Amino acid sequence: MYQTIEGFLQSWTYETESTQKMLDVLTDESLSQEIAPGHWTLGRVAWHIVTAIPVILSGTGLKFEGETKDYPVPTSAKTIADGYRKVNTAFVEALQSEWTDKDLTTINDFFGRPMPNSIFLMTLINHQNHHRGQMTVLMRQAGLTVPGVY
Ligand code: NI
Structure with missing residues (x-):
């Protein structure tokens, strides 16, 4: 659970700052970096994080502007990093x-499944952190x- 809104935002602020810093380092070239042949690229991992914000929160009824489809993926890393900033x-x-x-x-x-809003929010952070973990391997492999x- 999260007892308070400000309590969540102290956690969320560290998560978003950290994610945004990584997104800010990505280059257009790095986006093509692949997990493996036939698997997702870094560009898709990154856009999935962006789009995950409105997708995970949709059932809470909290309404706000943000792309929800993670395909097609933008070709410019500036679109992705700016997208994340905007929707956050x-x-x-x-x-x-x-x-x-x-x-x-x-x-x-x-x-x-029925769950309190706090679990939505817990799920948002956990999901984002899993995929940012993935991004870090791919970023390294792209020479960034x-x-x-943490
Ligand atoms: Ni996912």
């Missing part, structure tokens, strides 16, 4: 406008300098 801002703006601490207990539907996390 719209998200955090909507949370601060519409929710107070009690809203974290409201039960909503997460793709079929990875800023640290």
Whole structure:
């Protein structure tokens, strides 16, 4: 759980700052970097993170602007990094406008299962962190300098 909105934003601020720093280092060339033959590229991993914000939060009913389709993938790393900045801002703006601490207990539907809003939010962070973990290997393999996390 998360008892409070500000408590979540202290966690969320570290996560977003860290993710944005990595996105900011990506080059257009690096986006083609692959996990393996026949597998996802770095560009797709990165756009999946961006699009995951509105997708994971959709069932909470908290409404804000943001692309939700992770295909096709942008070809410019500036679109991806800026996309993340944009949608994070719209998200955090909507949370601060519409929710107070009690809203974290409201039960909503997460793709079929009912869960409190706080679990949506826990899920957002965990998902993003898994995929950022992936990005770090691929960034290294693309010859980029990875800023640290944890
Ligand atoms: Ni995923």
